[PDB]
Each structure stands twice: as structure tokens, then as C-alpha cells.
Design an enzyme around this catalytic site. Structure first.
Site, PDB file in Angstrom:
ATOM      1  N   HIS A 181      22.143  -3.036 -12.969  1.00  9.14           N
ATOM      2  CA  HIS A 181      22.396  -4.054 -11.969  1.00  9.14           C
ATOM      3  C   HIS A 181      22.518  -5.367 -12.729  1.00  9.14           C
ATOM      4  O   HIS A 181      21.516  -5.835 -13.313  1.00  9.14           O
ATOM      5  CB  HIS A 181      21.274  -4.113 -10.944  1.00  9.14           C
ATOM      6  CG  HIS A 181      21.145  -2.856 -10.151  1.00  9.14           C
ATOM      7  ND1 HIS A 181      21.861  -2.628  -8.996  1.00  9.14           N
ATOM      8  CD2 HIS A 181      20.419  -1.737 -10.373  1.00  9.14           C
ATOM      9  CE1 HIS A 181      21.573  -1.422  -8.534  1.00  9.14           C
ATOM     10  NE2 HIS A 181      20.696  -0.863  -9.347  1.00  9.14           N
ATOM     11  N   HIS A 198      20.201   5.892 -16.149  1.00 11.41           N
ATOM     12  CA  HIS A 198      19.375   6.867 -15.458  1.00 11.41           C
ATOM     13  C   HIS A 198      20.215   7.530 -14.374  1.00 11.41           C
ATOM     14  O   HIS A 198      21.256   7.013 -13.958  1.00 11.41           O
ATOM     15  CB  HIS A 198      18.094   6.260 -14.874  1.00 11.41           C
ATOM     16  CG  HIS A 198      18.309   5.313 -13.740  1.00 11.41           C
ATOM     17  ND1 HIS A 198      18.597   3.969 -13.922  1.00 11.41           N
ATOM     18  CD2 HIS A 198      18.217   5.502 -12.403  1.00 11.41           C
ATOM     19  CE1 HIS A 198      18.708   3.390 -12.739  1.00 11.41           C
ATOM     20  NE2 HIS A 198      18.482   4.297 -11.803  1.00 11.41           N
ATOM     21  N   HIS A 248      20.448   8.141 -11.120  1.00 12.45           N
ATOM     22  CA  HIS A 248      20.472   7.846  -9.692  1.00 12.45           C
ATOM     23  C   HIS A 248      21.903   7.665  -9.214  1.00 12.45           C
ATOM     24  O   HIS A 248      22.811   7.373  -9.996  1.00 12.45           O
ATOM     25  CB  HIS A 248      19.671   6.578  -9.351  1.00 12.45           C
ATOM     26  CG  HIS A 248      18.195   6.791  -9.245  1.00 12.45           C
ATOM     27  ND1 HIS A 248      17.292   5.742  -9.319  1.00 12.45           N
ATOM     28  CD2 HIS A 248      17.461   7.904  -8.999  1.00 12.45           C
ATOM     29  CE1 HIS A 248      16.068   6.217  -9.186  1.00 12.45           C
ATOM     30  NE2 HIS A 248      16.143   7.522  -8.970  1.00 12.45           N
ATOM     31  N   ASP A 305      23.495   5.366  -7.639  1.00 13.95           N
ATOM     32  CA  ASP A 305      24.212   4.120  -7.844  1.00 13.95           C
ATOM     33  C   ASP A 305      24.570   3.867  -9.304  1.00 13.95           C
ATOM     34  O   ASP A 305      25.216   2.845  -9.580  1.00 13.95           O
ATOM     35  CB  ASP A 305      23.430   2.900  -7.284  1.00 13.95           C
ATOM     36  CG  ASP A 305      21.981   2.832  -7.725  1.00 13.95           C
ATOM     37  OD1 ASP A 305      21.330   3.864  -7.986  1.00 13.95           O
ATOM     38  OD2 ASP A 305      21.449   1.695  -7.786  1.00 13.95           O
ATOM     39  N   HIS A 306      24.254   4.789 -10.229  1.00 15.16           N
ATOM     40  CA  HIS A 306      24.619   4.594 -11.629  1.00 15.16           C
ATOM     41  C   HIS A 306      25.317   5.806 -12.241  1.00 15.16           C
ATOM     42  O   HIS A 306      26.189   5.625 -13.096  1.00 15.16           O
ATOM     43  CB  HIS A 306      23.379   4.209 -12.442  1.00 15.16           C
ATOM     44  CG  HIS A 306      22.637   3.068 -11.836  1.00 15.16           C
ATOM     45  ND1 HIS A 306      23.145   1.788 -11.807  1.00 15.16           N
ATOM     46  CD2 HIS A 306      21.469   3.030 -11.152  1.00 15.16           C
ATOM     47  CE1 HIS A 306      22.312   1.007 -11.143  1.00 15.16           C
ATOM     48  NE2 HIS A 306      21.281   1.733 -10.741  1.00 15.16           N
ATOM     49  N   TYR A 360       8.166   2.285  -4.671  1.00 14.93           N
ATOM     50  CA  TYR A 360       7.371   3.327  -5.293  1.00 14.93           C
ATOM     51  C   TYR A 360       5.886   3.162  -5.003  1.00 14.93           C
ATOM     52  O   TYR A 360       5.350   2.044  -5.000  1.00 14.93           O
ATOM     53  CB  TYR A 360       7.551   3.317  -6.810  1.00 14.93           C
ATOM     54  CG  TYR A 360       8.930   3.671  -7.347  1.00 14.93           C
ATOM     55  CD1 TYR A 360      10.029   3.854  -6.511  1.00 14.93           C
ATOM     56  CD2 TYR A 360       9.129   3.798  -8.722  1.00 14.93           C
ATOM     57  CE1 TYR A 360      11.275   4.171  -7.039  1.00 14.93           C
ATOM     58  CE2 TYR A 360      10.366   4.119  -9.253  1.00 14.93           C
ATOM     59  CZ  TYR A 360      11.440   4.289  -8.412  1.00 14.93           C
ATOM     60  OH  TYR A 360      12.669   4.614  -8.969  1.00 14.93           O
ATOM     61  N   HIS A 384      11.348   3.727 -14.116  1.00  8.59           N
ATOM     62  CA  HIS A 384      12.223   3.721 -12.942  1.00  8.59           C
ATOM     63  C   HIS A 384      12.644   5.147 -12.588  1.00  8.59           C
ATOM     64  O   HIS A 384      12.665   5.533 -11.408  1.00  8.59           O
ATOM     65  CB  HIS A 384      13.437   2.822 -13.179  1.00  8.59           C
ATOM     66  CG  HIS A 384      14.372   2.758 -12.003  1.00  8.59           C
ATOM     67  ND1 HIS A 384      14.182   1.910 -10.932  1.00  8.59           N
ATOM     68  CD2 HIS A 384      15.508   3.448 -11.742  1.00  8.59           C
ATOM     69  CE1 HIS A 384      15.154   2.094 -10.050  1.00  8.59           C
ATOM     70  NE2 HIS A 384      15.976   3.017 -10.523  1.00  8.59           N
TER      71      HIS A 384
HETATM   72  C1  R3N Z   1      18.131   3.727  -4.991  1.00  2.00           C
HETATM   73  C2  R3N Z   1      17.652   2.374  -5.505  1.00  2.00           C
HETATM   74  O1  R3N Z   1      17.175   2.605  -6.850  1.00  2.00           O
HETATM   75  C3  R3N Z   1      18.814   1.323  -5.472  1.00  2.00           C
HETATM   76  C4  R3N Z   1      19.045   0.889  -3.984  1.00  2.00           C
HETATM   77  O2  R3N Z   1      18.179   0.239  -3.388  1.00  2.00           O
HETATM   78  O3  R3N Z   1      20.150   1.188  -3.516  1.00  2.00           O
HETATM   79  C5  R3N Z   1      18.585   0.068  -6.346  1.00  2.00           C
HETATM   80  N1  R3N Z   1      18.351   0.318  -7.708  1.00  2.00           N
HETATM   81  C6  R3N Z   1      17.658  -0.580  -8.328  1.00  2.00           C
HETATM   82  C7  R3N Z   1      17.555  -0.565  -9.841  1.00  2.00           C
HETATM   83  O4  R3N Z   1      16.835  -1.446 -10.418  1.00  2.00           O
HETATM   84  O5  R3N Z   1      18.257   0.328 -10.360  1.00  2.00           O
HETATM   85  C8  R3N Z   1      16.737  -1.450  -7.533  1.00  2.00           C
HETATM   86  C9  R3N Z   1      17.009  -2.930  -7.807  1.00  2.00           C
HETATM   87  C10 R3N Z   1      18.527  -3.334  -7.610  1.00  2.00           C
HETATM   88  C11 R3N Z   1      18.456  -4.657  -6.870  1.00  2.00           C
HETATM   89  C12 R3N Z   1      17.136  -4.518  -6.112  1.00  2.00           C
HETATM   90  O6  R3N Z   1      16.269  -3.716  -6.901  1.00  2.00           O
HETATM   91  S1  R3N Z   1      17.127  -0.998  -5.789  1.00  2.00           S
HETATM   92 ZN    ZN Z   2      17.767   3.814  -9.934  1.00  7.89          ZN
HETATM   93 ZN    ZN Z   3      19.958   1.103  -9.171  1.00  8.40          ZN
END
Ligand code: R3N
Ligand code: ZN
Ligand code: ZN
Ligand code: R3N
Ligand code: R3N
Ligand code: R3N
Ligand code: ZN
Ligand code: ZN
Ligand code: ZN
Ligand code: ZN
Ligand code: ZN
Ligand code: ZN
Ligand code: ZN
Ligand code: ZN
Ligand code: ZN
Ligand code: ZN
Lengths: 266, 266, 266, 266
Positions: free
Chosen positions: D224, D83, D85, D87-88, D190, D159
Site C-alpha cells: 500500500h 504476502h 492476500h 489485494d496483493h 487482528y 501481517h
Molecule cells: C484485507 C486487508 O488486509 C486489506 C483491506 O482492508 O482491504 C488492507 N491491507 C492492509 C495492508 O497493510 O496490507 C491494511 C492497511 C491498508 C490501508 C489500511 O490498512 S487493510
Molecule cells: Zn494483507
Molecule cells: Zn493489503
């Protein structure tokens, strides 16, 4: 009563759509488009470059000629454009979908390409084609290097705001050949003076004549080969009559000055 | 061992983020940004125009000051930009979502805005902001008319490729006031000479000094008010010390020449 | 020998291009397109909404009918779409340039609109139109409120991935009228089974039949009025024969089941 | 008085940014990201595929690990995403500029990627990254084949609207290994019920639990790694404790049901 008119397709002289086999320009440069539209394939050890593709319906022919030259779809690395009109950038979107190719263009060409040539400063929506995205934005004078061949951008705004000449050095009979792919310098049906969508049109054309004049230019090619006096159907004499960049620029300025005078009188 | 560094936020002097009440420049022109970042509201019978919005976090403050001036979100018709960096175009995306406003910009500014300032020629990805799309692409010298007020674009490439001065005529005490909103002419940390991402940088700056010199300019404003010697916190004397466009251009050229010399020595 | 074929324009039956005067549907809802293509104008105290515009060449006619209704270009606030094909979203780009209107669409419709209908899952590049950008992305079931009228999106993927029904409540003779603008449920020339570009096509259509079945629906309208048995040329009886949403869904499923059987045999 | 707040960088636990050497998953699949963020390299005779890249600052590390694996920038052909976001998908734009890679994503992921994660349904503009364009739009169940390895998309909205699981078959000890890269099923902070920006959020999550349950899944990986009980720092036992797709789906549904109950009470 009277319905609105049907959409009118962008139609062109048959010779613009007449396929031709690859015609060698220099050691690694080939004309692979049609009789009357330029599409230049430059082959390197590190992949191939395409400069223009002609009309939208030329994509498969281009890929056939690339195959004939030893270039698979994965091998096409880069597409460069003279300008983003339907008769020169037409098949770019489809080529990107079907090959590894990425597009490099200046900002003006990129925004016209991304709208498929719609909202053209002069043609409106009469001459559209499938939109495509640029992968890299180039500035005036910037170089791009593929497999050791160095392409230099020379902006020459006028025919479109983003009109560009591309120059590179190939070889032939062991000697260097400075190739200049100079964009169109025509103004077909344009309002030249006092154009609210292009207020500095005349100044840009005049600067572009000077730019073309001064290009490194052992061999000139143009998107419409007839503008540089090429005859792609003439085989071993296809380029014999070709203009110099100086002569091309001078002829285009003479024509432009005539058009200005006729517009003042018209 | 050692993790990669955290992302670093784009942080700025506090005065750049200090809200101020609307400050009247002329009959229909107001500064509505912060103490040290310009955001100009021009009010017409036919809707309002915003020139720049400052930093990304200024959107709500801008809308609060617009309300104070009698401008609802529906009433904001047009956003114009000096250049598409985070400290001047920051809140544009959010303003478009929250108002009726459409963006007009040149092709260079449009492609930088659409990538949220990423892949900046000089800053890389260090100074990004939410991306936004332009609704209209303007050419050099093109005019846009809102509620009878005529805005003219003057390209002045350098600080960014798409840097633009915007000029319009307001009134004050029954008399016309030719306002020039001239873009930044700084080059903060830039490689000026031989920059492969901007080969003609120096020439563009020099032409831009000349462009700014010659603008219609009873009153000069600049995106960073200190560059034109404005003090937005000084109330009725905020503009008393303001530079002419000629003086602004001269000071910027002097600074640029010093930077060139230091770069040669450095 | 044989040139490549000329580009073929997207041509349609004349009645699809036949202008008509505004036809009132309910107190604030009007058909303002052509005899055989729907374009719905919804008038509010707070500006007007347009649902579809028909073919690309209908923009000026649409603006003429809006004027006739008291809607200036500044007054058009919002464009909504059934789906992003050339015969329904054709003039959207031009309407955005000529009015205050912003586009709201789901992600699928937005990405097809932004490529001007090119690379269609079924039609390729045969049916293209000027590309346009969405200003707001909507999710299934999301509401948008203009001047007190509440529009609800109901995704009904199939004819295109982003096909959407739009519902709102108007009034007539003091009573509420729940209007359902349901998208096309046809599959013209589509490969239905095992389509690599749309693997779950059949499931999506079946879910879409059920969605349409269940819509709040005192009055059904459709992008091609004949699909809901409207006759826009029949004046005061234009809507007399109109289908219910239940009947429309049932007829479309019957047709779809026949097409599946014919495809298996073909 | 009080300035507006500075922009706040998106900061993460250090282990998310801790580089690791390539960790082999199967014959042609490697984890090449950081200790606590997945980035999967799949190597084929015909070029390499990357599934996710982690955070924006990971681009150079990813290219270093690719080099270590025998993958030059020209060799990276395709980027796929769980997805869009920060962090990915963080480094996708930069990877596209620095490699041959093209992006394939569904429409929802493409429109979020193109806005750099801004205007997120839940996070607003708090978590942005450099925007990138998709080269190919995929539909649910569509396959993409690289060097003989077949990747299948399974939409699992929740998500993010465009959340996707990617499945492919590798080998290990001469035997086939069905790898499932299943997206996040979390809902961090959320609003689940009655969310106006995502009205069918709960239904989509429930369908996504069922989708994940049923995936072809000899080996589960997740963006993750802790969500699937991987420990990338544990070397030869990194995957020993990994969950089945059934167990992952069940744990995520249990957590989601708890969050729903807490939201009702909160
Ligand atoms: C911007 C946010 O989406 C992310 C953040 O907090 O930095 C993490 N993404 C997660 C996922 O599932 O992609 C959640 C998970 C990772 C460990 C705790 O919940 S929290
Ligand atoms: Zn995410
Ligand atoms: Zn994430
Ligand atoms: C859409 C138009 O731009 C094109 C057209 O008419 O189809 C040609 N392009 C030209 C160019 O110079 O690119 C002009 C030249 C070609 C031969 C006649 O004038 S006309
Ligand atoms: C991202 C950068 O462009 C900005 C920054 O440093 O935050 C400023 N913009 C300036 C401009 O001229 O726009 C320069 C001026 C402002 C005062 C010091 O130099 S520095
Ligand atoms: C490009 C095509 O989508 C359109 C065309 O043929 O021009 C029509 N759209 C239809 C729809 O349902 O939108 C189909 C209907 C209209 C009447 C016959 O089938 S066919
Ligand atoms: Zn050679
Ligand atoms: Zn042209
Ligand atoms: Zn041409
Ligand atoms: Zn006044
Ligand atoms: Zn700046
Ligand atoms: Zn600045
Ligand atoms: Zn009424
Ligand atoms: Zn259709
Ligand atoms: Zn149709
Ligand atoms: Zn192997």
C-alpha cells in the site's frame, strides 16, 4: 527375526537408460531421449516443446541434447505427456525447476503426476517418481499452439486413465508430415476383468484401439519405440520399419484379446 | 477517471439460501440443505455420508441439521459431489476442517475443487469458492461402501467435465428403494458448438442423457430440486411430482436441442 | 557404451525395519514402530493419534499394532510429524487412504510432504516417498486437543525447515508425565555454512538447541530412539538410560560444533 | 423466514482500483499497478520480474502496462510476492495462465496462495481469490537472480505468517539504488494477544520491525504506497515524501503498541 523388506528401486533394461544423440524425425521434430525411451523435442521460432522425458534420471541428458539443438533452458516452453508413469514422466518435476517449461495435461494425468505416480491403479506404490504440478488442464480434442505448430490431444484411456495421443503436422522435403505420438496400449500385469479400481477398463481399451486406428498418421511414434517398430539406434533407417497407426492398434488389440483369454483361464 | 469494477459476489435466489429442517427421503436418507439446494445426508451404523453441501455459506446450517439427526462432526465420514461448482460444493473445504469427513471424487471434479472453481471452462473466475482437496479419486462405475450402503459412481460429463450421478439402495416400508442422485444436465450460458475449451461437449451431453435414462431409479433427486420436480417445502408431498430419470433425461435433451438451435441462429 | 545409472532405492539398517510389538511408554502412549524407528500411538476416549510412521513399508505393521491396541482404522483421527523425511513420514499417504486419519503439520512440513520429500534442500531427489496432503496447518506454539490430550507444537527448524517437537502430558502410576517428542538435531552430510538453499541454517540450529533445552520434559523420545538413548528392544528397561532434553540438546550442539569445524577444515 | 446472507464481495476503495500508466522508480523498476496498490515491474535483458499484482481484477491492466514497457507475456519470467492476500496476490493465477511467469515464494505464502487466501488466520473465508501454485520455495535470505538483478528475501512474519521483504539494487543517474520492497506491518482487526491460530504473533511482529529497520534501503516501497508515504498520482514527486525503512518500522511499531493497549482495554 525377519525385518520388513527394503524398498525396491524401479529398475529397467539398460537400453532404456542408454543415452543417444538427437535423431531427426522431421524438419523440427527430434528424438532426444535414450535408445529405448522416447522423448520428442519440437523446435519452433517461439520456443521448444518436449513430449515425454523418459526416466527420472534422464533430466540432465535431455537438457544436454536440447543445448546441442540450440535450445537453452529458457527456450523450453511446454511439456506434454503420453501418460504419467515413471518411465515417461520421470524427470518432469526437475525439468520444470531447471527450465521455463510449463506442463499441460488432462485431469487424470495431472492427478497422477501430482502424486508422483503413487497409488497407481495397478502398480500401487511400486513405481513412483518426483511429483509435479500441471499448469494447464486440457480436454479431449483441445489444441495447443506453439510457434505456429498445432498440437491436438486425443484421449485414449486404458494403459492409464489419462493416456493421451498427441498429433501435429511437421514438414520434410517441403511436404507436410502428420506425426502421431500414440500412447502405450499395453496392460502389463493388469487385472482386466472386474477390476474394482477400473470397472470400465475393457471398454476404454476398445475405444482407445479405435481412436488410435483413426489418427492422422503419416508417421507413428510411441513412448516405447519398439511398440511402433522404431529402432532409434539404426540411424538413417531408424524409422524404416515403423508401423502404421492402424497396424499398431490392431497388434495391440490382438495382444489384449490374448491377455483377456489367458486371464479367464488363469 | 474510471476505476476497474469491484469484484462481484456470486449471488443467488433467496430460496436457494432458505434453511429447512431435515426432510426424510427414505429410511436413512435425508435432505438437509435449503429449500432450493439439495444436500443429502445418508446415515449408517458406521458413520454418515453427505452428497453435496450447496452454497459456501451453508456449512453451519448443514452441521446443525446433522446434529438434529444424531450426527456429530466426528460421525461424518465421507463427502460425495454431483459436480464441483460453488452452489453445490461451496462449503466442502470448511466441512473438511470441521468434521472427520474425507472427499471422494473423480479426477475432473478433484482438479476443479482444488482450484475452488476458478478457471471454469465457461464461467472463468466469476463463480469461485474455497478450494478443497480430494482424498480418494474414483473411476467410472467404482463403488464406495459405508456402513453397508453401497454408492456407485456414474460419470455424466457435460454440465462440468466431472459431473457424476450417485446411486444407492435404501429402504422404506421394508422395501428397497433405488435412489438416483443425478447431476445437472443444464448448460447455462454455455457455448455448445466449437468450444475450444470443450471440443466434445455435445457428444458428452448426448452420452450423459443416455446414462441418466438408464440409471437404477425408483426415486430421482437432483442438485437443484426443481430440475426433478421436487418441492422441498411441500412436506409430505415434497416428492410426489418427482420425475423419473427417463423423463428428466428427455426434458434435458429437449432443452439442450433448443439451445443448440438458438445458438446456431444467434 | 555406458547407460545412465539405475535408480537407487533408499535403503536403511535392518534394525530400522525390524517389527516390534507395542511398547508402553505411559498410560496412553505406546511405541508401535520398529526397533530403531519411533512411531508413537496415543490412545484417547475420542480416537487415536499417531506421531510419525517411520519408513514407507511400515504401514501394514503400524495398522497391525494399532489393532493389537484396540484401534481400528476408523479410530485413528490424527497424524502428527516430527519432520517430513522418508524414514519418519514414509507411510503417511497410505495411512490416510486406509484410515480416518487427517494430517496436521506446519507449512514447511506440509510443502515437503506434498512433494514426497523430493527437491530436498540437502538430499535432492535421493530420498523420496509417496506424497501426502496436510489437512490442517499449525503455527508455532499452537495446540491440538484430542480426547482431552493436548498436543503443543514447538518449531525447531534445522534438520528440516519444518522440524517440530511435540509435547503432551500423559499419566503413569496416577502421576502426570510430560512427554517431549523432540525432532532430530542431526545434519547428515549437510553443507552448514553459506548454503544457498538455507542461508540461516546455523542460526536456526542454534535456536533449536535452545528450544529443545527448555521443553517440558519428564520423558524425552526422538524419531531415532538412539539419539535419546532409548533401546526399544530392552523391554522393561527400554527407557532407563534415556537422555534429558537438556542433555540431548547439549550433545547435539557439541556434535554440530564439531561438524562446523570439520567443514571449515574440509 | 430469513435466508442465509448472500456472499459478500471483497470491495475496496476506488483509488485501489484506479489504473495508472507505468511510473518509473529507477532505471529498470516501474510501478505498473493502480494509484493505491503497488505492482512492481523489474526489466532485465533476460526477462521481466513482477513483484505483486494487486487485486484479482488487475490482470489485464498489468499486461497492458507490461506491453507498454516492451514486455510481452512470454517475457515475464518470475512473480514474487510481499504476502498472499487478495489485494496483493489477487491476479497471480491468471497471470500464470497468460504468461511465462513462474512464482517463487516461501512455504507459508505458498500454502496460503494455494488455498486462494481461504482459511485465513484472521479473515476466515471473507477475502478469497483464485488459488495458484508456487514453482519454487524460498528460504529466509535466499537470493534469486534474473538477468543479472539479484533479489534477496527477508522474512518479516506478522501481517501474514509468510510476509516477506524483497530487496535488490537498481541504478539511477549512473548510481546504485538499493530498493527495499517491504511488506505490510499492519494488523487490521487482528486479535494480537493469546491468538490460538498465531500464538507467537506479537514476537514475530517485533522481530519484523527490527528486520525492516535494518534493510538495505536507499528507497522504500510498500504494497500500500501510503504506508511508505508514496503518492503514485504525484508524477515527478511521487516518491519525494517517502519514508526511510527506519521510519516505516518505527511508525508501524508505534501503531502496533497502540493497538495492543486498546485491545487490553477493549
Ligand atoms: C484485507 C486487508 O488486509 C486489506 C483491506 O482492508 O482491504 C488492507 N491491507 C492492509 C495492508 O497493510 O496490507 C491494511 C492497511 C491498508 C490501508 C489500511 O490498512 S487493510
Ligand atoms: Zn494483507
Ligand atoms: Zn493489503
Ligand atoms: C511400469 C511399466 O508400465 C513399464 C515397466 O515394465 O517398466 C513398461 N511400460 C510399458 C508401456 O507400454 O508403457 C510396458 C511395455 C514396454 C515393453 C513391455 O511392455 S512395461
Ligand atoms: C453457476 C450456475 O451453474 C448456477 C447459477 O446460475 O447460479 C445454476 N446451476 C444450474 C445447474 O443446473 O446446476 C443451472 C440451473 C439451475 C436453475 C437454472 O438453471 S444455473
Ligand atoms: C535421510 C537421513 O536423514 C537418514 C538416513 O541416513 O537414512 C537418517 N536420519 C537421521 C535423523 O537424525 O533423522 C540421521 C541420524 C540417524 C542415525 C544417524 O544420523 S541419518
Ligand atoms: Zn523448418
Ligand atoms: Zn506406463
Ligand atoms: Zn512404459
Ligand atoms: Zn433403517
Ligand atoms: Zn453447476
Ligand atoms: Zn447449480
Ligand atoms: Zn488411562
Ligand atoms: Zn530426517
Ligand atoms: Zn531420520
Ligand atoms: Zn539500464
Amino acid at each position: 527375526e525377519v525385518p520388513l523388506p527394503q524398498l525396491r528401486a524401479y529398475t529397467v533394461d539398460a537400453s532404456w537408460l542408454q543415452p543417444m544423440a538427437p535423431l531427426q524425425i522431421a524438419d523440427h521434430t527430434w528424438q532426444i531421449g535414450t535408445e529405448d525411451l522416447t522423448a520428442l523435442l519440437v523446435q519452433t521460432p517461439d520456443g521448444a516443446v518436449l513430449l515425454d522425458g523418459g526416466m527420472p534420471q534422464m533430466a540432465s541428458h535431455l537438457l544436454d541434447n536440447m543445448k546441442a539443438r540450440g535450445v537453452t533452458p529458457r527456450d523450453l516452453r511446454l511439456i506434454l505427456l503420453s501418460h504419467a508413469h515413471a518411465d515417461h514422466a520421470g524427470p518432469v518435476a526437475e525439468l520444470k525447476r531447471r527450465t521455463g517449461a510449463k506442463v499441460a495435461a488432462n485431469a487424470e494425468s495431472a492427478v497422477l503426476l501430482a502424486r508422483g505416480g503413487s497409488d497407481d491403479l495397478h502398480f500401487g506404490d511400486g513405481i513412483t517418481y518426483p511429483p509435479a504440478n500441471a499448469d494447464r488442464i486440457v480436454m479431449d480434442g483441445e489444441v495447443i499452439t506453439v510457434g505456429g505448430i498445432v498440437f491436438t490431444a486425443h484421449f485414449m484411456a486404458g494403459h492409464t486413465p489419462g493416456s493421451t495421443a498427441w498429433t501435429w503436422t511437421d514438414t520434410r522435403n517441403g511436404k507436410p508430415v502428420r506425426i502421431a505420438y500414440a500412447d502405450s496400449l499395453s496392460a502389463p500385469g493388469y487385472q482386466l476383468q472386474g477390476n474394482p479400481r477400473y470397472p470400465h477398463l475393457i471398454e476404454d481399451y476398445r475405444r482407445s484401439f479405435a481412436t488410435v486406428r483413426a489418427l492422422p498418421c503419416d508417421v507413428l511414434l510411441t513412448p516405447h519405440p519398439g511398440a511402433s517398430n522404431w529402432d532409434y539406434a539404426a540411424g538413417a533407417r531408424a524409422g524404416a520399419k515403423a508401423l502404421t497407426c492402424k497396424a499398431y492398434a490392431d497388434a495391440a488389440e490382438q495382444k489384449f484379446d490374448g491377455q483377456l483369454a489367458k486371464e479367464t483361464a488363469g
